Design a protein around this ligand. Structure first.
Ligand SMILES: CCCCCCCCCCCCCCCCCC(=O)OC[C@H](COP(=O)([O-])OCC(O)COP(=O)([O-])OC[C@@H](COC(=O)CCCCCCCCCCCCCCCCC)OC(=O)CCCCCCCCCCCCCCCCC)OC(=O)CCCCCCCCCCCCCCCCC
Ligand SMILES: CCCCCCCCCCCCCCCCCC(=O)OC[C@H](COP(=O)([O-])OCC(O)COP(=O)([O-])OC[C@@H](COC(=O)CCCCCCCCCCCCCCCCC)OC(=O)CCCCCCCCCCCCCCCCC)OC(=O)CCCCCCCCCCCCCCCCC
Ligand SMILES: CCCCCCCCCCCCCCCCCC(=O)OC[C@H](COP(=O)([O-])OCC(O)COP(=O)([O-])OC[C@@H](COC(=O)CCCCCCCCCCCCCCCCC)OC(=O)CCCCCCCCCCCCCCCCC)OC(=O)CCCCCCCCCCCCCCCCC
Ligand SMILES: CCCCCCCCCCCCCCCCCC(=O)OC[C@H](COP(=O)([O-])OCC(O)COP(=O)([O-])OC[C@@H](COC(=O)CCCCCCCCCCCCCCCCC)OC(=O)CCCCCCCCCCCCCCCCC)OC(=O)CCCCCCCCCCCCCCCCC
Ligand SMILES: CCCCCCCCCCCCCCCCCC(=O)OC[C@H](COP(=O)([O-])OCC(O)COP(=O)([O-])OC[C@@H](COC(=O)CCCCCCCCCCCCCCCCC)OC(=O)CCCCCCCCCCCCCCCCC)OC(=O)CCCCCCCCCCCCCCCCC
Ligand SMILES: COC1=C(OC)C(=O)C(C/C=C(\C)CC/C=C(\C)CC/C=C(\C)CC/C=C(\C)CC/C=C(\C)CC/C=C(\C)CC/C=C(/C)CCC=C(C)C)=C(C)C1=O
Lengths: 54, 365, 70, 231, 68, 46, 108
């Protein structure tokens, strides 16, 4: 009997806010500023060498 | 039976330090193919005591790796040789790994065992994936009070003569001369009666050991020589908050001094929260200490052991690219760029997994 | 990647052919020259100035909301 | 692992763990009618009904953007109650707060509703994103079922049902197939399936069963490291 | 043989500093900046540095006065 | 536009190594979100 | 007068009971429709909503639904006294009597 089960059709989509995006988030937090900051200073500059440059 | 398999042999006194064979217990893992872990117990301490730690479902360490509870030379069932040079004792492990067909292994140790484990990574790093040291540090401990007691007890054990002394004469000698309960119990269980009840003796070579400790020079086990060098690979240190062997104040610096990749406290060096108790050295006895050691051990084996230095964790394998040094490759028509370093199979030498998968890859194409 | 880089590629389509197909795979100094000036997407092509504006814009804008929301 | 050792960590000048009435110099003092001429105070007895209407608004104004999704309306209600039940279930003695916790919380919920009336509250935007990702995954299952194809979720259930049969056919000495044993079997499959997503199963080896994938690799010519230098 | 991997390392760090000086400076000074001095010290650094630059600017101007 | 590949080394398989091919798209996706704001502001600026 | 129902716009219908038997049936159908209600068949006219897993915040959601089905405008001062099925039945009657005598809806 369990194998005979079926699945209902779900909704196509929920509400899409016309003024919120992943790159331009509507509301503010220090989390998004952190993403923009580490994109500016770039990722950790990993050295492949055995001694420091200086 | 199956999970617990300890090869059986008789110790052999050897004149040549290269003809030394190590013997110990092997704990099989739950899964078919798993990397191997070689663990060295405290000096004069039984390997069996660590079995319940490595065979506890709550910890589930065997789910990660197969464990070799191995005895160093002059200890337990392994061969006997007066020298305790960590370079010689390290070569012993390399022959064991060869005889047992182990390409590379994870090394661990408790107390002085941790030194022996770390020494192997210092002398043979290309074949060691990581080191996990418990209540030990690459340091001269000759003048630590805890070591002196151990050094003192071993000297008292030289006074007993099993031929003349009776069983009761021994028990009285230990209680009075040995105050620490655990050391007392450890030494009692190390006493064994050879076949035909010829006489009783210690499983470890009491003569060779006492000379090493009593002489109290560079070759002593308490000492860590500059000759041992630096360990290039992954290393994690775990010791009690109040430990007589490793003091949090200054005994952490040797780790940075000897281990190049050690980041520091909270990343590769941890202390277990606990009270002042001289028995805290034996973490496997107290559940609170053991639960923390196990969790940190499983984390080291799962995410950090056998991972390239410049990679953070095992998660970065295949998605983090390491910078390349210019003029580092033989090919002249090579465009230098970032690359993900190669991580190989744990026993790729003694199997043909690469030859097999190469064939399967061709069938796809 | 951005539209301006894509415009270069359409203009440098024949140049990309000469340097990459012919020169880059030769041997000698002609190959070293082609593999060095190979045309494609930029290694370390990010623009820190553009990224700096984005950071200071987001940081200063969050300050505006606090100061203006009274 | 690590416990706070200081026994006086939760001590305040007002008592142990007192975050309702911190000790301050200008402390509340009583008022006497016979001696009081005039007074300026903002406290009133309107917080109860404001607590009721605020709920009705925050609920009704959020449902405007649920598109009749009944399962979402019921989920949102459970979340809305968790926000209004904070004063009733907290360790903080909300009835002993300095100048009236009732007025304090009501005025706080009013600030949340104002953002809700504009559809700018981070809980709303978070609900839309979370729901859209959920329906995209449910619709993917529906499209694969209408084609008679098998879902990745059903393949696991069938693979786990048969493994249980294999493990209990050898468990004759005992007959307690604990929930612990059922779990480690499923997790072992999950870890292999989890690693399979990034490295799919090409051959009989299975998901993430190729050693060659872990040999030295290089970025493709068409996608180099954009963020930093390579050498 | 020498260490041919260190060849042209000074030129390479110079170009990275030009590409993104704030990122090169940030990461090369990260472990040092973990220990931050007090507000007073930080202010003295800035104050004395900007004051030295302000006097340098006045000396540049006095040179134009001597040229005139 | 198509990019000429010297074919000096083989590129990693996208299925086995997908993260290596993602950065390019998310970068354009960012720019498209900015353009939506430029267009939406035509009446305010005008 | 239209609302979304599972993503589809549907015209909303309002009810006019004007009869005691029709009210008791509507409230039960209403209370039984709420996903928080327990023992839906054990629910009767003299059932305390507290005994069926309902609190003060659930009575609001129920009243909010009464406004949708009947078109009433219920004030916040009246909601917190609706704690039994009998209360919804008597309140619905009092509203029908008020509009039948005063010709207007009660103060909201
Ligand atoms: C026409 C011809 C004219 C042009 C000719 C061309 C010449 C162009 C010149 C370019 C030269 C090549 C450039 C190479 C890179 C930059 C130089 C460098 O050393 O980088 C490596 C150096 C570290 O080398 P590393 O081995 O790769 O790093 C390993 C570890 O990660 C590092 O951290 P660690 O702790 O883990 O390891 C040890 C660490 C320990 O030491 C340190 O970490 C240093 C601690 C500093 C941080 C402490 C906090 C202070 C910083 C706060 C930030 C304030 C500035 C920003 C705020 C305002 C915004 C602008 O490093 C050291 O071993 C010792 C430090 C190096 C020796 C001392 C150098 C001192 C001067 C460097 C800073 C410049 C000061 C300003 C001077 C300019 C005056 C206008 O990087 C830095 O520490 C910072 C670099 C910033 C330099 C900016 C100036 C560039 C101009 C260079 C000219 C030479 C200096 C002239 C000043 C003379 C004063 C005495
Ligand atoms: C019959 C008439 C004939 C007419 C023509 C006559 C001409 C005679 C030609 C024959 C001479 C060449 C002989 C062949 C050499 C073969 C040797 C060899 O195998 O390569 C060694 C050498 C080794 O370099 P490497 O092994 O690759 O790596 C270097 C290390 O890693 C080191 O790099 P690092 O990153 O570690 O940093 C340290 C570096 C850099 O350290 C520095 O900081 C120095 C930076 C110097 C440049 C910047 C000066 C500052 C002013 C400008 C500011 C620029 C930066 C500003 C930044 C922006 C500011 C905001 O130190 C160096 O100086 C490297 C120089 C290379 C080593 C040679 C020994 C130098 C010791 C003496 C040092 C003092 C002289 C410096 C000369 C400049 C060198 C670049 O490679 C060469 O450079 C070969 C050069 C030969 C090129 C020949 C090209 C054709 C010549 C003919 C063309 C027509 C000329 C017409 C002239 C007309 C009359 C004027
Ligand atoms: C030592 C003590 C004393 C120091 C004294 C002061 C030192 C000099 C200060 C200069 C400061 C000027 C700042 C300019 C704006 C920078 C704004 C910015 O966001 O930076 C990122 C910015 C890059 O942003 P981007 O525009 O998006 O370019 C990225 C693209 O992906 C790029 O595409 P790509 O990756 O394919 O390109 C390769 C890349 C790497 O290749 C190279 O850059 C190496 C070779 C470059 C040639 C050598 C440079 C010679 C000087 C340039 C020509 C004269 C000045 C031009 C005017 C520059 C001022 C804007 O090239 C670049 O990095 C960018 C192009 C470099 C400029 C070349 C063209 C110059 C002509 C400019 C024409 C347009 C302006 C109109 C004319 C303006 C005059 C009216 O960096 C620059 O553009 C150049 C910055 C140069 C800074 C060098 C020194 C910095 C560190 C000084 C330390 C001071 C000591 C205190 C430290 C304390 C530490 C404790
Ligand atoms: C192209 C133009 C060329 C000309 C200009 C060239 C300029 C080159 C300057 C380049 C940068 C200098 C080198 C810095 C190395 C990187 C940073 C560093 O040091 O690593 C951190 C390391 C320790 O810092 P930390 O790890 O962060 O620990 C601190 C705690 O976190 C928290 O702190 P704490 O509780 O542990 O202790 C309190 C605090 C103590 O509070 C302080 O930090 C003291 C600083 C107060 C402000 C001083 C005024 C600002 C100076 C810059 C403006 C110059 C004014 C104009 C000068 C006119 C005359 C030329 O300690 C500190 O935070 C750091 C003090 C250590 C001394 C810092 C380095 C000397 C000062 C900077 C030299 C400036 C020279 C500019 C002109 C040079 C011309 C030849 O510092 C050291 O390297 C230890 C070295 C031993 C220092 C003690 C003995 C020094 C005795 C010599 C004094 C020389 C005075 C020079 C006077 C200049 C003329 C008036
Ligand atoms: C209801 C009760 C009251 C509630 C008040 C509400 C308080 C709200 C706090 C808000 C916090 C804001 C957070 C954001 C800022 C954080 C960033 C920061 O810079 O903080 C320092 C921050 C923390 O430093 P720290 O090492 O942790 O030390 C913290 C304290 O200094 C502690 O250091 P310490 O433990 O070693 O203590 C020693 C202390 C020892 O001090 C003393 O023992 C006595 C002080 C006596 C002062 C006597 C003054 C005499 C004046 C004579 C002048 C006469 C000339 C007048 C001209 C008249 C012309 C006719 O000396 C100092 O610490 C010097 C600190 C400098 C303070 C300057 C302000 C003084 C008065 C402020 C009054 C505010 C109302 C408070 C009322 C309370 C009354 C009970 O420094 C940083 O590391 C961040 C980077 C700083 C870079 C330097 C450039 C920063 C400047 C821009 C900052 C951002 C914009 C401006 C913000 C305001 C800055 C003043
Ligand atoms: C409104 O709310 C606010 C913000 O948003 C929230 C803020 O971020 C801020 C903070 C402000 C910032 C973060 C901005 C910081 C910017 C600063 C300090 C100045 C930046 C200066 C530069 C980046 C240098 C620019 C130099 C040039 C443009 C000259 C070189 C270019 C040349 C000569 C090209 C010719 C340009 C033109 C003819 C102009 C026409 C415009 C174009 C786009 C044409 C482009 C053409 C091509 C071919 C690309 C404030 C104050 C604010 O009020």
């Amino acid at each position: 009997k369990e194998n005979t089960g079926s699945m209902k059709k779900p909704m196509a989509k929920a509400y899409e806010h016309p003024y919120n995006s992943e790159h331009h988030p509507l509301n503010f937090s220090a989390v998004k500023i952190a993403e923009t900051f580490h994109d500016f200073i770039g990722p950790e500059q990993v050295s492949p060498h055995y001694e420091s440059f200086a | 039976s199956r999970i617990i398999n300890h090869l059986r042999g008789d110790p052999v006194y050897q004149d040549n330090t290269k003809d030394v064979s190590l013997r110990g217990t092997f704990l099989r893992g739950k899964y078919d193919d798993l990397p191997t872990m070689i663990f060295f117990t405290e000096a004069c301490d039984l390997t069996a005591n660590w079995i319940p730690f490595f065979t506890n479902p709550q910890y589930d360490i065997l789910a990660h790796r197969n464990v070799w509870l191995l005895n160093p030379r002059n200890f337990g069932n392994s061969d006997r040789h007066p020298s305790f040079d960590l370079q010689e004792m390290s070569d012993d492990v390399m022959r064991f790994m060869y005889s047992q067909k182990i390409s590379m292994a994870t090394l661990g140790g408790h107390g002085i065992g941790g030194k022996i484990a770390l020494a192997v990574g210092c002398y043979h790093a290309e074949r060691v994936t990581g080191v996990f040291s418990i209540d030990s540090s690459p340091m001269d401990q000759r003048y630590h009070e805890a070591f002196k007691e151990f050094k003192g007890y071993v000297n008292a054990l030289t006074e007993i003569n099993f031929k003349t002394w009776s069983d009761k004469d021994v028990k009285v000698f230990l209680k009075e001369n040995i105050k620490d309960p655990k050391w007392r119990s450890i030494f009692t269980n190390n006493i064994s009666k050879n076949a035909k009840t010829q006489s009783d003796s210690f499983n470890f070579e009491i003569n060779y050991l006492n000379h090493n400790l009593n002489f109290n020079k560079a070759d002593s086990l308490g000492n860590w020589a500059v000759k041992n060098g630096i360990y290039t690979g992954r290393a994690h240190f775990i010791f009690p908050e109040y430990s007589r062997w490793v003091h949090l104040a200054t005994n952490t610096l040797p780790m940075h001094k000897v281990c190049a990749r050690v980041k520091g406290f909270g990343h590769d060096i941890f202390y277990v929260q606990g009270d002042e108790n001289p028995l805290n050295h034996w973490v496997y006895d107290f559940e609170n200490y053991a639960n923390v050691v196990a969790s940190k051990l499983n984390k080291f084996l799962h995410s950090y052991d056998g991972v390239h230095a410049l990679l953070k964790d095992r998660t970065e394998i295949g998605n983090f690219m390491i910078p390349d040094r210019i003029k580092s490759r033989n090919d002249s028509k090579h465009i230098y760029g970032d690359y993900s370093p190669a991580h190989l199979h744990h026993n790729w030498r003694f199997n043909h997994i690469y030859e097999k998968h190469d064939e399967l890859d061709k069938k796809l194409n | 990647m951005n539209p301006i880089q894509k415009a270069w590629l359409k203009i440098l389509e024949p140049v990309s052919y000469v340097i990459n197909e012919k020169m880059a795979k030769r041997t000698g100094i002609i190959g070293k020259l082609g593999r060095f000036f190979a045309i494609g997407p930029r290694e370390y092509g990010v623009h820190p100035i553009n990224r700096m504006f984005i950071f200071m814009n987001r940081k200063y804008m969050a300050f505006q909301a606090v100061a203006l929301h009274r | 692992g690590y416990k706070i050792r200081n026994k006086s960590i939760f001590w305040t000048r007002a008592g142990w763990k007192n975050n309702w009435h911190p000790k301050n110099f200008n402390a509340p003092r009583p008022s006497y009618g016979e001696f009081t001429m005039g007074i300026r105070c903002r406290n009133d007895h309107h917080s109860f009904l404001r607590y009721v209407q605020t709920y009705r608004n925050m609920s009704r104004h959020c449902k405007q953007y649920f598109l009749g999704d009944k399962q979402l309306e019921e989920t949102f209600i459970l979340g809305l109650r968790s926000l209004f039940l904070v004063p009733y279930d907290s360790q903080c003695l909300t009835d002993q707060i300095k100048h009236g916790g009732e007025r304090r919380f009501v005025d706080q919920l009013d600030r949340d509703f104002e953002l809700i009336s504009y559809n700018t509250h981070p809980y709303q935007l978070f609900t839309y994103t979370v729901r859209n990702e959920h329906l995209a995954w449910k619709n993917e299952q529906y499209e694969k079922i209408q084609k008679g194809e098998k879902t990745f979720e059903q393949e696991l259930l069938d693979y786990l049902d048969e493994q249980v049969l294999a493990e209990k056919a050898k468990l004759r000495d005992g007959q307690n197939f604990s929930i612990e044993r059922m779990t480690e079997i499923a997790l072992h499959v999950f870890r292999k399936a989890r690693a399979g997503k990034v490295r799919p199963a090409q051959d009989v080896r299975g998901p993430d069963g190729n050693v060659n994938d872990f040999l030295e690799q290089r970025r493709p010519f068409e996608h180099p490291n954009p963020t930093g230098v390579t050498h | 043989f020498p260490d041919r991997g260190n060849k042209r390392r000074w030129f390479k760090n110079l170009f990275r500093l030009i590409k993104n000086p704030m990122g090169y400076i940030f990461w090369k000074t990260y472990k040092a900046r973990l220990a931050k001095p007090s507000l007073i010290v930080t202010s003295m650094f800035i104050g004395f540095t900007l004051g030295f630059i302000k006097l340098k600017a006045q000396s540049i101007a006095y040179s134009k006065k001597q040229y005139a | 536009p198509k990019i000429v590949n010297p074919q000096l080394w083989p590129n990693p398989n996208k299925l086995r190594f997908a993260d290596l091919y993602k950065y390019q798209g998310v970068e354009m996706k960012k720019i498209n979100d900015s353009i939506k704001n430029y267009k939406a502001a035509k009446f305010y600026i005008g | 007068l239209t609302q979304y129902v599972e993503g589809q716009i549907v015209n909303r219908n309002q009810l006019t009971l004007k009869k005691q038997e029709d009210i008791e049936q509507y409230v039960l159908k209403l209370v039984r429709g709420y996903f928080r209600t327990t023992n839906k068949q054990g629910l009767n006219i003299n059932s305390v909503l507290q005994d069926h897993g309902l609190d003060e915040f659930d009575s609001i959601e129920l009243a909010m639904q009464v406004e949708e089905d009947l078109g009433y405008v219920i004030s916040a001062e009246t909601i917190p006294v609706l704690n039994k099925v009998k209360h919804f039945v008597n309140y619905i009657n009092h509203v029908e009597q008020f509009k039948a005598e005063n010709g207007k809806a009660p103060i909201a």
